[PDB]
């Protein structure tokens, strides 16, 4: 129902002129805050968070991010040594946050990956840290002897949830909106095969069902989907194709089921 997620990436090789540390936060999947090691300021990324926060809020967020940056700066060297690596391209990622589910239960998580693979994760229910690899056991041991679980549990169950509920209210008009897609069916024939495409442009919220129908009946044989991909403006896009016989285009319809459409939409080429 609602989610607050913060993530960060620390890179040894971000590329020329690119920041090596990037931290971003999301409410209900929408980017609302950003920090990196070049600008070194945590900033708002939606109008609804900007309108409902003050300078002290962003000074505090910046302080937190700068601390995270110095910890992960050293973390890059620490794990290279843990894995007996010399230099090269390496990354440290973490993600943490809280979910408010539809019945009202709360979930919280904090997990890490090294070079894109699971490294360690909080097990809040036992107040331990779950090592995913032998290399994470020294980290697990230090965090468990150091009683970091207490403050992490408090953040995930109290602070995270309390602020998520505020963010959802601040952004209620934007997060709760519905935007109707613009749908185009197109066809291309090659190698004796008619490939029909159906693209839904600009829908919000993200969940959608796009299906191909033949003579009224649903068809998935030789159908392919590109999944849901983002637009620059917070809306979404998806395409689905199906292969047909040349001359059979009139028998196909694209069906779009979306929260913005009280009745599903049917589209012809």
């Amino acid at each position: 129902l609602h989610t607050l997620r913060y993530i960060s990436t620390a890179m040894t090789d971000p590329g020329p002129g690119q920041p090596w540390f990037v931290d971003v936060g999301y409410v209900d999947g929408e980017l609302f805050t950003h920090y990196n090691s070049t600008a070194r300021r945590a900033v708002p990324r939606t109008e609804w968070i900007a309108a409902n926060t003050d300078q002290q809020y962003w000074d505090s967020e910046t302080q937190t991010s700068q601390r995270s940056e110095q910890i992960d700066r050293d973390g890059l060297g620490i794990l290279q040594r843990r894995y007996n690596q010399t230099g090269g391209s390496h990354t440290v990622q973490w993600m943490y946050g809280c979910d408010i589910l539809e019945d009202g239960t709360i979930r919280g998580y904090r997990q890490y990956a090294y070079d894109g693979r699971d490294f360690i994760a909080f097990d809040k229910g036992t107040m331990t840290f779950t090592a995913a690899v032998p290399e994470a056991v020294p980290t697990k041991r230090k965090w468990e002897e150091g009683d970091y679980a207490e403050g992490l549990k408090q953040y995930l169950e109290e602070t995270c949830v309390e602020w998520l509920r505020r963010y959802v209210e601040y952004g209620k008009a934007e997060l709760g909106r519905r935007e109707r897609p613009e749908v185009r069916v197109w066809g291309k024939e090659a190698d004796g095969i008619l490939t029909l495409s159906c693209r839904a442009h600009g829908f919000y919220p993200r969940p959608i069902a796009v299906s191909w129908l033949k003579d009224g009946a649903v068809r998935g044989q030789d159908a392919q989907s590109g999944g849901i991909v983002p637009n620059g403006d917070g809306t979404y896009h998806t395409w689905v194709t199906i292969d047909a016989q040349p001359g059979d285009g009139d028998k196909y319809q694209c069906r779009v089921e979306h929260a913005s459409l009280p009745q599903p939409g049917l589209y012809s080429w």
Binding site: G75, R110, Y155, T159, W163
Partner: peptide, 9 residues
């Protein structure tokens, strides 16, 4: 808000 913590790897 972000979690200000001092968990080092």
């Amino acid at each position: 808000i972000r979690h200000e913590n001092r968990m080092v790897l």
